[PDB]
Design a protein around this ligand. Sequence first.
Ligand code: SFG
Ligand code: SFG
Ligand code: SFG
Lengths: 624, 624, 624
Amino acid sequence: VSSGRDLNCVPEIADTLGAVAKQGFDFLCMPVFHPRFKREFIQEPAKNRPGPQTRSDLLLSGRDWNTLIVGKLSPWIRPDSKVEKIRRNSEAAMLQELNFGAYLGLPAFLLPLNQEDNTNLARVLTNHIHTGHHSSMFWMRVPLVAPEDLRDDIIENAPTTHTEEYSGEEKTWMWWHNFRTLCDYSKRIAVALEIGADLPSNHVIDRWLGEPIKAAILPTSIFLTNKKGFPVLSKMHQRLIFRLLKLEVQFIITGTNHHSEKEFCSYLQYLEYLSQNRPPPNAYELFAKGYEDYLQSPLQPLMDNLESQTYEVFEKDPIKYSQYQQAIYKCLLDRVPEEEKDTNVQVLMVLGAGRGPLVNASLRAAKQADRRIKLYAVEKNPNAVVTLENWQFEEWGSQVTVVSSDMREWVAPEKADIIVSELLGSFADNELSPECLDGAQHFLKDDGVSIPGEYTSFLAPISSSKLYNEVRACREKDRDPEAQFEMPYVVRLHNFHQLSAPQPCFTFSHPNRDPMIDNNRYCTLEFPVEVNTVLHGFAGYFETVLYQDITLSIRPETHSPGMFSWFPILFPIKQPITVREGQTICVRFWRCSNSKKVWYEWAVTAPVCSAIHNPTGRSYTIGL
Amino acid sequence: VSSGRDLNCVPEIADTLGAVAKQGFDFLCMPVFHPRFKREFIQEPAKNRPGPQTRSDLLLSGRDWNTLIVGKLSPWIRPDSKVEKIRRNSEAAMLQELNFGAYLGLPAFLLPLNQEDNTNLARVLTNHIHTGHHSSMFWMRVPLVAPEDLRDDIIENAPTTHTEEYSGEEKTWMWWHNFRTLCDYSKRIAVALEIGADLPSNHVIDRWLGEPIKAAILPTSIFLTNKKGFPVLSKMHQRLIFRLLKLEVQFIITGTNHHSEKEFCSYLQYLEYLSQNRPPPNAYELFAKGYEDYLQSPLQPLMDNLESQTYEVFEKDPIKYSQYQQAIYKCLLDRVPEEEKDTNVQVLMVLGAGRGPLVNASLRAAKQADRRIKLYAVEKNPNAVVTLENWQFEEWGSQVTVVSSDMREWVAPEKADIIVSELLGSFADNELSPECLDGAQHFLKDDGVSIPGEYTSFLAPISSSKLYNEVRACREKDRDPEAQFEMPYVVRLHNFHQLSAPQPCFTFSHPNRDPMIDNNRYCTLEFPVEVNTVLHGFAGYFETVLYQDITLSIRPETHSPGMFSWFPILFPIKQPITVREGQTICVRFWRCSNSKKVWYEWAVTAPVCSAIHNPTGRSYTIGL
Amino acid sequence: VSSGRDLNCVPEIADTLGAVAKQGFDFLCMPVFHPRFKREFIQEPAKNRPGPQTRSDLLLSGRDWNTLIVGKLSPWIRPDSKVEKIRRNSEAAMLQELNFGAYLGLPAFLLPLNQEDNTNLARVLTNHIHTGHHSSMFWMRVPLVAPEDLRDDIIENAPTTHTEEYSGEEKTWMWWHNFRTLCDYSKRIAVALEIGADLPSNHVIDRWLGEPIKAAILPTSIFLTNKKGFPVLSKMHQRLIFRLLKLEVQFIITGTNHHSEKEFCSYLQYLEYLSQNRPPPNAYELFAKGYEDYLQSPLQPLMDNLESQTYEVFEKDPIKYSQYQQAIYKCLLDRVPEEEKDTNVQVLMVLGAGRGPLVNASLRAAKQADRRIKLYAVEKNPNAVVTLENWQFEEWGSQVTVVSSDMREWVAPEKADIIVSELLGSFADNELSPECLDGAQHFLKDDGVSIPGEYTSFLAPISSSKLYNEVRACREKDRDPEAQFEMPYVVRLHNFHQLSAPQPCFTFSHPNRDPMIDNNRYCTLEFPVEVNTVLHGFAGYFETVLYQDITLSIRPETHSPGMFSWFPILFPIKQPITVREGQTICVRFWRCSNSKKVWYEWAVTAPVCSAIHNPTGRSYTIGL
Ligand SMILES: Nc1ncnc2c1ncn2[C@@H]1O[C@H](C[C@@H](N)CC[C@H](N)C(=O)O)[C@@H](O)[C@H]1O
Ligand SMILES: Nc1ncnc2c1ncn2[C@@H]1O[C@H](C[C@@H](N)CC[C@H](N)C(=O)O)[C@@H](O)[C@H]1O
Ligand SMILES: Nc1ncnc2c1ncn2[C@@H]1O[C@H](C[C@@H](N)CC[C@H](N)C(=O)O)[C@@H](O)[C@H]1O
């Protein structure tokens, strides 16, 4: 676990660093100027105070400044002070300290958010950021519970508020939110969240869910003492540590030793014990590792010819093919009884056969069912057809006929009893499985079966300031400056908050036994929200019925165990939308088309209206 | 040394790869389709030939396709054929092979330039590149000497040309140049240069100097046989190998074994011997390693406050400070004779003292000279002033007065005998050393000395298709689309060709004892060119006189031994300019200013005119 | 005719303006500072000369400064002087005069190009332009014949060159060309061309053909004297005046009265006489008026539904429909003899019937031929179908069946004897007439006729610095910064020079009785050039065979009399290409496609290579 020591007293830098390294800490948060050394910038004689203003950069190597030191703003610096003289000396001192940090090449610098009004602090920080590049982080020190809200009820004529204030208990989140809004969501501004002795109510904690937390500050004072006299944490504090470890935050130990009989390293030893004894990660968490909140363009296997290694990645999912095999096995037994098993040969067409794993799944299914099949393997990608025709000649034989064709253009010699396909995207129909299957429908027998028989997409509103920032950074040269917000992204959503339960969006059935075949759709979804938050977009998932009870799902509540073929999809919004507890999020999604392209259009109509996203597919289309 | 085996016969892929790996090769260039398997795409019955069209992608792992295999275009593919049927089947086959390579995820693919007209080949390749991203390389197989020019004089009625054709001997360079011009200088298109038995004249070879050579092809047939019977190369071929090793090219062995008595690995063993026994690299080549053709923004120490690690990097150059010390030592002996050595105290002002290495150099110089000095250390960067004031208190004492001020604004208590500074850029005056020293001039005694006393910038025309491509790639969002060509770059020039000897551009003297002080300049330079080439820009260097014979230089012919503080500067041009042998390159450079900014403007007026670059400093300025 | 008086002596501004207005002049070119009042900017005591520096702006109204005055640079201003002092005072004086002109809001300002080296003049002008907006014009005063080349042969030891120097006689064009290249083709920089007593050879004159000439300067000294004693011009000077009137240039009279017996207004009276007695303009020149060098996007009637007024504009061309009628009339007589005239009913299908003018032309043709027809009017545009179905009901009756369908999708009840269409663009096949007709071909009888039967596109290399500047200005936000050069433009080419005779590019025939139907094409054109010039692009035209000898043409040498339906097309190049007399321009054009789009690709391969323009249709496509 990555840990740091927070100190406000550094007599000698090399000796302090050395003692802190001996305790097992990876870094030290410390003042870069003496915390009591208030400086005057305007009024004589104090403005002319002889130097040096602080200690020399030569006391540490450049590597040590770059890796072991987190800088700290002096505690007297008050840019939002009501005294003009204090405000102006504070602005000049803030710049001077931030500039010294940049001179040192510090990896991070700590600034407090200890009151509601930090407008001028924000302004001075924004001006500092727009002076060079640096890449250096700014960690905003904000507590879960404000100091005014955790004070002892020991003032006889000014008692503490014994009334529950739902939105008021959430006041420190609003201090952070206003600060980062003023600073225009800078990627360089993150949260150093300070944990208190008494944890606030759940709602107050999970307000921070999709916020960019880079560090968690643990005061030595919040630790309890166990039977042996060592510092430990309450079960609820342990639960919070485990949630923070999932976000890979850096842990900061602040304060003096409150367990005097023990060495100070015991606070860190306990933290390292919790890290070692954390619940282990599943096969999905192990596969998804490195892909957390990493944005990707959804694959378009109809418009583009997929590379060999994309097919190899699809083939690594055994759950998906064992589900397809089980579905084909069940369908073969329902179509051919025991008496006909040796005479009745079922025509099976794999539509979009890729490198052949579905062809092999159909063959294993037929051997399992003890039924006879005749296979056609249809594939438009001529590169995948090389793999197919080599497999056919070497292993499959005459039982499999490889067809190099678009399923919509193919003239079939026979009609199929069963059509098998895997043309599904993360939003089910976003790879144009309805259009492809509609075009192939005519060569399926009247009593013919399509595997999959049905699919349904799902949407859920999400809060994530990190993902909003990631999408924003996708602005490109030579295109609409807001195009990146008008397109979906395949992404393993990590640092986010799901604001309401997923609801069905669009459904498709196969075969499509309707005279007025229209794949266009318009859906209105009403999402009840139970917390105060910010809406940054919509997470999309899907569910499919392969055959009867044999299904595949990426919707979290029904997620197919151990299946990693599809990560969720993200539909962003151009502008974050404030949502109050008790309010309903209303979203409208359209599936649109012409003869050449298919696309999605979307808009929020409640609590406030957004603009219609991706009108006429100006930013994003799916090629037919 | 990175080596590859070129083969046109692969019976079994795994066995061939295995035998090639056993020989010591890092990779294999091979056909991805049988080289004799001509395919028909339009006319029946041959267009309907049963598959597979080639061997399966499943024969190797994805890692092996990505790292060990370079693909090859089939030899019958002739997109520039005069037969329409051949041209159309060739276009379809070229796309099919390039698409199979992309499907395989091949790191590189070989295409020949074996004739003058490759227009349609260029067109088909450009369309392939604009279909996805891939990042994959295209190696254009081009010989130093065309096959028509190396044929035996054995045709009685068609003799070989026994007449010297200067431009005609350079014909293969023009085949490459036209191809890459048509393809619009794609970063994905590089040269695989084929070496022949008889090397062409020097001029023909060095035509390739600043060209993007990624591979060098050595036919087994060019090797001579030594006393023991092993394959070796002529001394001239060895010279060329050593020049190619300096460019870090990949070496390709092509052809059959012509030294039958020996194992085939002997060709590679010899190559590995030459690599091991190459001339060693100097202290500059060792420092510059990793910075070859890497573009950087020139530092602006007047406008910006330099970071601690930039000062540390400056301090790593001992040659520069020992030169300054020697100059100060010589000047102190000329100003104070032996009789006055104990009474006469020389006032020395270090103007732009940074972290203090010049202050220490002045102190060492005074101890060496056995003369008395009084020091003032002037520095505008308040972060560097922290370092200075700590050094002053701990080591220097009262002998050094640290001054936190801009030298142009500073009111001096005394007048200086000597002013010492190091305000020089790679183009000498580009950090605004003239403006700074002009502003400080008034506090220098009438008989006062400035160290440096003088500096001169130099320019030389250069050819480099790699650097032109690197500059081009610096296009940014939210600025003029051609701004990147209108600014200088500090760069360790590597893959380039200097077209004419450097000539002086601008000169400055200190002190400036002229009533009409004007730092603006206008220079016309005439560069005689002795080879056929392409002008992509101008390399800039400088020379300075510290004191008398004590100098500093980055001009290559006078370069200060072991001094790495300054890399050359590059002034690009928006459009490459063709230059014929015997022609003069004429360039015009202006140094311009206003009260707030200084800048350069430049234009080529001969053999053809360019546009005036950076007019009014619209793309690049140096802040005052 | 718009005329101005050039003077270098203005004692009183109001009196001079008044006398000049009385003579009939529209404007006055005059010094804005006394032409002899040389100013010093650096050296005392002359730099401190008491003001005013010139006469007051208050002497004229703002409207008079904006409309009646063209400013003049002082004759002593020599920015390219070899004397540094002269050069620096000249730079400061040039800026001061240009700045006073901008202060006055002058519509134009005259600067001379009276020598080869104007590099510094260019630099000072470019810096002036990049200081604000102004929109104000800069007229570069350049003679047809250099003053060194028209001097009297009266120096006994320095005789005039009596040797013909083809390129040397063209030296003033190179002075202009280098100046405007340095200034980066500014839209604010134009030519004021000074005509001399002896006109140079034709080649020297027409070098200026596609150059931005805004004014023509006539010295009073070039005028001859007629019988009555009035100033007149030679027949050759009259020919040049008429060519300049076609470009709508402003005429400037310079010099003193050389016809003393006559009033000075006689020079202007003669000029006004020539303007009045100019050859009159044709019906095409009358229609095209206002469209000269105005760039337009070529219409795409397949991809877009044309507006009612676009159809109205097509219908204004009677020549086009009378040609179609004559072709149909001739074809009906060849298919049905006199004996069958009352029994044989010919099936005629108008494919892309628009608002119906071809339907009416077919009906008039059948009445003329005295033959029976059955009509089908096929139209995909449903808005045009409203017009059609109303015409059918009110006038046509049962004889015409209106079909609302794409001709490629339409299932015909009968087969056609004749298919009639007008799907041609300015480059013939650029509206996708081959694809449309190929799709409709199946419902034409075996002996069936297509009207048009054939079409051929033509290309010709052109020089036009104005059109290059117009194309350049089409850069748009949110797209490739060079996209505007990679697309054709429909344009009535005016201020240009055709460099070689038009040659055939692509040909199409209907019906397409070929098994291997491919509408893709690749053409190589070799253009012999007989003058020194700059290549800025290619003009495109077409020719079509409606039936037998009944044709339509926009190729200039065969242009259909009085037909204005199509203006030429312009294919630009990204970079201007220098071409020497005797050199060949080689161009390569490709017609490319996929299932959804058609496009052109083009490149110059000689005398130098260009990049391949519009690869993969990245900048321009024609929707299918
Ligand atoms: N209309 C179409 N006609 C034929 N093949 C198609 C069509 N649309 C998509 N495909 C192919 O269907 C495949 C979809 C793949 N994502 C799945 C591959 C394979 N069935 C598997 O499960 O591994 C790709 O190989 C596409 O090239
Ligand atoms: N006008 C100025 N007044 C004072 N210091 C300046 C001025 N212009 C530049 N400097 C400083 O001069 C230094 C230039 C450095 N590149 C050299 C540092 C040091 N003398 C060395 O050789 O390592 C920087 O520390 C600048 O901040
Ligand atoms: N494939 C198509 N099917 C049907 N109509 C088409 C097709 N392509 C183009 N058109 C129509 O053909 C017409 C072409 C026009 N420029 C000419 C109109 C009319 N024939 C005239 O001469 O005034 C338009 O009305 C188009 O909408």
